[PDB]
Amino acid sequence: MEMEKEFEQIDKSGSWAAIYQDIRHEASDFPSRVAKLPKNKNRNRYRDVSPFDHSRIKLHQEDNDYINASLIKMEEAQRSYILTQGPLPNTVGHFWEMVWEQKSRGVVMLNRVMEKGSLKCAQYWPQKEEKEMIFEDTNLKLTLISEDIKSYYTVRQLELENLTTQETREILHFHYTTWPDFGVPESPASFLNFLFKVRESGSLSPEHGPVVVHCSAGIGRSGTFCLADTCLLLMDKRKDPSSVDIKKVLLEMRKFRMGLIQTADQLRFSYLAVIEGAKFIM
């Protein structure tokens, strides 16, 4: 079926939970043996969210190459994404090592450091120009260059230096600051505006390594971001845009990381975002 009318048909019939459970039943199951090794327990935020072995990002380190991060490679859309958990106190250096080694331009953050009165990820970037951060375990230096605070999101320019080679690179930090503590946004308008700002920066384009996208577990809000981006790109590329099947795209993405889209409300919100985004395109 088309999307907008399939949408109203699920609303009128109140069957979002049944649609979402079908997706959960059909989703891929692949091994995640490296994530579960005892030496990696303090590298995982949640015991039930792990990268598959076949698609995990490897650190360029011979001691321990493990990080909780997955490469989502979308062949028809010609887009790649790295989806990862919010960094932990003992993985902030690994996180920036990955950004460096994978040649990423942009980092997309969809959570606040504290939500619901608890810590959802480490404070992993510097908040003042004159107070830079050094990650001694991975030999990197990170400096805040500029910050632009808007009503729904903040954009930061960062300098990452590999202290071993003295090479430097400019990283863009795109921070969506207004996702509610409970539920999903009422309107997709500010989320779509944010996606378009990431696109306009070059961070999603083939001349760079994959964008790094995270929330707390790296599957819910993060899944919504890449699902909406890929569906809108496919609608622009194909002769028949009504042929884009959001459930099929989501199942394709779940071949590369488990659990993408965590609730039936996030599934409905993803439909809403794609439907509204397609118009604005023309």
Give how far Cα 93 sits from Cα of 65, 71, 90, 133, 146, Å: 13, 19, 8, 10, 22
Task: Find tokens 């919010």 and name the residue.
Answer: 86
- Residue 156 marked as a ligand binder: no
The one-letter code for the residue type at 104 is: S
Q: Where do runs of H (alpha helix) occur along the chain?
A: 3-13, 16-26, 92-101, 189-200, 221-237, 246-253, 264-281
| Sheet-wide strand order for 211-214 | 56-58, 66-74, 79-84, 211-214, 106-109, 167-176, 153-162, 140-149, 133-135
Q: How far apart are the first and last CA of the chain?
A: 21
Are 257 and 72 a contacting pair, CB within 8 Å?
yes
> Which value, in Å, is the radius of gyration of the alpha carbons in the chain?
19
Tokens of 236: 């622009």
- Residue 181 marked as a ligand binder: yes
Give dist(CA 232, CA 211) in Å, integer: 17
Residues in the chain: 282
- Residue 231 marked as a ligand binder: no
Give dist(CA 214, CA 121) in Å, integer: 10
Give dist(CA 120, CA 97) in Å, integer: 21
Experimental determination technique: X-ray
Give the resolution value in Å.
1.7
- Residue 219 marked as a ligand binder: yes
- Residue 262 marked as a ligand binder: yes
- Residue 221 marked as a ligand binder: yes
Most distant CA atoms of the chain, gap in Å: 60
Give how far Cα 26 sits from Cα of 86, 213, 221, 256, Å: 27, 25, 21, 14
- Residue 209 marked as a ligand binder: no
Which residues have C-beta within 8 Å of that of residue 68, sequence separation ≥ 6? 35, 43, 44, 45, 49, 50, 51, 84, 85, 91, 218
Its CATH architecture, for the domain 1-282, is Alpha-Beta Complex (3.90)
Which residues have C-beta within 8 Å of that of residue 178, sequence separation ≥ 6? 151, 152, 153, 185, 190
Active site residues: 215
- Residue 157 marked as a ligand binder: no
Q: Are strands 56-58 and 66-74 parallel, antiparallel or unpaired?
A: antiparallel
Task: Find tokens 């202290």 and name the residue.
Answer: 163
- Residue 117 marked as a ligand binder: no
